[PDB]
Amino acid sequence: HSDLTFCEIILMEMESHDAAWPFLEPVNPRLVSGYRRIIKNPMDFSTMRERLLRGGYTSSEEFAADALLVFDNCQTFNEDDSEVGKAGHIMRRFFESRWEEFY
């Protein structure tokens, strides 16, 4: 669980980050056209928080894959110069920068 002790740190930092607003809650496909069709496996921070609190993550590698899935989805659905896309890149860089510090 010394792997998952840093996960709580990095998730709450991503939760409180300025550019996290597109990823705090799951996308509502009733509100975003095409999202159901485009994104097969949606992911967001609150779903990751949910899962981490019940301890569903067995290793820190599973936690990183959920993080990378938030940004892979973001880059698949949103243009790089979109508001959501621009935020996704800041969040993605922040996650990689922060993850590379514990490992």
Ligand X SMILES: Cn1cc(C(=O)NCC2(N)CCCCC2)ccc1=O
- Token representation of residue 85: 């896309």
Contact between 45 and ligand X per CB under 6 A:
no
Residue 46 beta carbon to ligand X: minimum distance, rounded to whole angstroms: 12
Work out which of 18, 30, 31, 81 binds ligand X, going by CB under 6 A.
31
Nearest-approach distance from CB 22 to ligand X, in angstroms: 4
Say how many residues make up the chain.
Answer: 103
Q: Is residue 23 within the footprint of ligand X (CB under 6 A)?
A: yes
Q: Using CB under 6 A, which residues numbered 61 to 100 contact ligand X? A: 74, 77-78, 84
Give contact residues for ligand X (rule: CB under 6 A). Answer: 22-23, 27, 31-32, 74, 77-78, 84
